[PDB]
Amino acid sequence: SVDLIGINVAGAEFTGGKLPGKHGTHYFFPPEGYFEYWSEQGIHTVRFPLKWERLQPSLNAELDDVYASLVDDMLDQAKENDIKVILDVHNYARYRKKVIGTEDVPVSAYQDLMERIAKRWQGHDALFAYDIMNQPYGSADKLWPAAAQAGIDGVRKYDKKRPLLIEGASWSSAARWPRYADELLKLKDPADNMVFSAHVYIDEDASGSYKKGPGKDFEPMIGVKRVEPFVNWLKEHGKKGHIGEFGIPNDDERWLDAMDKLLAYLNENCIPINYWAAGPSWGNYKLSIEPKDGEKRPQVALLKKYAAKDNCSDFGPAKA
């Protein structure tokens, strides 16, 4: 099923400079009982960041036993709690800081990673989709379309059915999406099951850092206005879409109003969202919606309201 409302569950990609790092010290997978809470809240789709260097510390090599087994366990817990999982290679189109498509990181090495991910997990019922790369940006933008094709070809060697979530250049910006997405139109999927996934934050610079408050002339429609270029591109080209990241602070009604207006527009166009972020080890991080004693999470009420209004059977927007 295609749920319009989902959440990022972040933690396995934390402390990216510590490689391999130690589970429970530098990075964190869901503990036992984690998925039960979100399932009870009516949230059944999760986007799950993974760090490429931890899954595959040598290019072209077998996946790391320890880290890949933690993914096995998390997928098992998801299935036990009726959670659908989008695996996210959360790597900015880079491996050990080098862009996919340079001599350091050939596209064939990225294809190898995606083959191994699909080979290991295509048989797992909790796996819903592959978000093949988080936020290409900067020096990776030009080479990203060719890298995306290699990642698509990699998954399709072993999984010929599941959707592939294809992000865009410039941090997968929804607001700037049509400026760069021309070369994504040339991507070819033999299974014809690609879904484009953009990101949107509503601080001034759209980084999602929220260094300041809303500001005097804050526009409540800012979220809608920043996803319109993306949704209109989908309609113009007959494509399907998705929003892989959006989040807001908990400390101003203006943020919540903009979130409500955004969710209404996504609902009208059958565009799913993955809120950023839940996760087992966020502490007092400003964008965390994980429960924490004494910290309010008004964003969750909005996600629940729109989960009850989900009447879509597929990724939109519908061609009508």
Author numbering: 1 to 320
The authors write:
Thus, to mimic the presence of the GluA/B residue, the variant RBcel1_E135Q was generated to determine its structure with G3. The activity of this variant was dramatically impaired with ClPNP β-G3 as substrate, with a k cat of 0.219 ± 0.009 × 10−3 min−1 and a K m of 0.263 ± 0.041 mM. The kinetic parameters strongly indicate that both the glycosylation and deglycosylation steps are affected by the substitution of Glu135 with a glutamine residue. The side chain of the nucleophile Glu245 is positioned as described for RBcel1_WT in monomer A and the apo form of RBcel1_E135Q. The mt-10° to tt0° rotation seems to impact the position of the side chain of Tyr201. When Glu245 adopts the tt0° conformation, as seen in monomer B, the hydroxyl group of Tyr201 is displaced by 1 Å compared with monomer A and the apo form of RBcel1_E135Q.
RBcel1, an endoglucanase of the GH5_5 subfamily isolated from an uncultured bacterium, has aroused interest because of its ability to polymerize cellooligosaccharides in vitro under near-physiological conditions. After the glycosylation step, the donor sugar is covalently bound to the enzyme within its negatively numbered subsites. Transglycosylation occurs when a sugar hydroxyl group is used as an acceptor instead of a water molecule during the deglycosylation step. Solving the structures of two RBcel1 variants, RBcel1_E135Q and RBcel1_Y201F, in complex with ligands has brought to light some of the molecular factors behind transglycosylation.
